[PDB]
Every structure is written in C-alpha cells, then in structure tokens.
Amino acid sequence: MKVAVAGDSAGEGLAKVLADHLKDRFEVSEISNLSDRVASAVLDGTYDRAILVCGTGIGVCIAANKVPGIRAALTHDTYSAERAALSNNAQIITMGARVIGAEVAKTIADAFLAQTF
Amino acid sequence: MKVAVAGDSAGEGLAKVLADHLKDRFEVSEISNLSDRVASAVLDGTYDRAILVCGTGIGVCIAANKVPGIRAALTHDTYSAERAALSNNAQIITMGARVIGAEVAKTIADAFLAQTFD
C-alpha cells in the first residue's frame, strides 16, 4: 500500500520520523495548499492513504475535508486512529507535531494503517 | 454570545455536562444530520459558535467542514482549543465523549470560548 507523509515547516521533522518508521511495511513517499496537493494525489490514485503533520493538525484537517471526496481525521490517540478507518473510512489522518510526541505519533500511524488496509 | 451544544447518542451525556457548565456565561442552546443542522445554524447567525460531541469527534468534524463557510476543529487539549479560535478561526469545535474525560472537556470548551470572543 502507498502512503504519502507530508509536513509543513512545523511538522516536517515528525513527518520524516513517521516516514522512516513506516518505510519497511508500506511504500512511503515523504512529500514535504499542502492538503490540496496531497488530497488531489489521493483522489487520482497516486497514494492509497496520507498522513499530514502540522502544528496542531487542525488546519490541514479542515483544508483536506474541503476537498470533495476526501475524508480526513485528526487522530491524537490510537483508539481514534482505528475508528478513523473502521467508522469514518478516512483516507487521510492528521496530527500536530506541537501537540503529541513522536512515539505516540508512530503508534497512531500504525493503528490507522493496520485497520484501513 | 450564543453557543449551541449538541451531541449524538454517544455524546449526549457530555454535551449536557458542557451546556450546564457554560449556561451562566453564554447564551447556551442544548440541542442533541446533527452536524449539518447545527453548522447551518451557526452559518446563518442563529448561534455564534457550536460545540459538537460524538464518540470520537471525527465524524462531526468531517461533516461540519463540508458545509461551505464553516471551519470545525476537533479539540482534545486546551492548546489546540485556543489554536482553533486564534489560528483557524473555527466557529465549531468537536470532542469525543469516548476519548476524553468530562473535566478536560470543560477546560477545552472554556479555553476555546475565551479566545473566540472578546
């Protein structure tokens, strides 16, 4: 499965951490308007799922959900990450690098991707 | 200032707690499809802001952001609650009653509404 991981200036560092953590189990593209570019690539099949990382995750979640056909979930715990897939069928999850820590972030990415696939 | 508070079946209990917490400092309407109706009532000026509560907060956040002109933020900490107002100018915040506890939820509501108004 193809997973895009992207971060703005605030979230680029955690995005790289997440990309490296996922690279052995998924085909990861670390591709750090951002929500628009990544959402369009999910819609046209370039990626199956995406993880967008900013300061809080709020702005990218709003912007991604404004793309028709995109469902984006801000996920800051592993239960919500699983529900984002099983209940909301989100293609995109978002996180805030200034809000949660890197080890929790990795468990959230893993929990979402294990359920959506 | 007029604040709608609404929950689905999973969020109704926490919505009532939040409405009771806020109703002395704001003109609170406790309501409890739901996302769209409340978001539209915020958009048309019936309410100034809204707090939507469901199981995780994700579904009501998705639905509200798909109303043109509405910005909705899932806020599970007080920092993000202040950012929802100050950075994203969100009219709506959402919470998950199965995810956070009621005392943290009250502080989140208070932190959002303190910044979104003057």
CATH class of the domain at B1-118:
alpha beta
Q: Do residue B61 and residue A74 have CB atoms under 8 angstroms apart?
A: yes
Instruction: Give the residue on B whose Cα is nearest the Cα of A93.
Output: B58
Q: Measured between CB atoms, does B65 come within 8 Å of chain A?
A: yes
Residue that the structure tokens 């997440």 belong to: A18
Q: Which of A46, A59, A56, A54 is nearest to A91 (CA)?
A: A46
Q: How was this structure determined?
A: X-ray
- Planar angle of CA B36, B25, B95, nearest 5 degrees: 40
On whether the CB atoms of residues A86 and A46 are closer than 8 A, the answer is no
* Tally of CB atoms within 10 A around A86: 12
Q: Measured between CB atoms, does A79 come within 8 Å of chain B?
A: yes
The residues of A annotated as belonging to the active site are 54
* Tally of CB atoms within 10 A around A32: 18
Exactly one of B54, B73, B90, B100 is catalytic; name it. B54
Q: Do residue A71 and residue B62 have CB atoms under 8 angstroms apart?
A: yes
The amino acid that residue A66 corresponds to is: K
Report the phi/psi class of residue B89: left, alpha or beta, with left for phi > 0 and alpha for psi in -120 to 50. Answer: left
Q: Do residue B87 and residue A58 have CB atoms under 8 angstroms apart?
A: yes
* Tally of CB atoms within 10 A around A43: 14
Alpha-carbon span A32 to A10, nearest angstrom: 11
Alpha-carbon span A52 to A74, nearest angstrom: 9
What residue ranges do the domains of chain A occupy?
A: 1-117
- CATH superfamily of the A1-117 domain: Sugar-phosphate isomerase, RpiB/LacA/LacB (3.40.1400.10)
The amino acid that residue B97 corresponds to is: A
Write the secondary structure of chain B as one string of H (helix), E (strand) and C (coil): CEEEEEECCCCHHHHHHHHHHHCCCCEEEECCCHHHHHHHHHHCCCCCEEEEEECCCHHHHHHHHCCCCCCEEECCCHHHHHHHHHCCCCCEEEEECCCCCHHHHHHHHHHHHHHHCC
Contacting residues of A for B79, CB less than 8 Å apart:
56, 98-99
On whether the CB atoms of residues A53 and A18 are closer than 8 A, the answer is yes
Q: Do residue A73 and residue B80 have CB atoms under 8 angstroms apart?
A: no
Nearest CB to B73 within list A58, A73, A83: A58
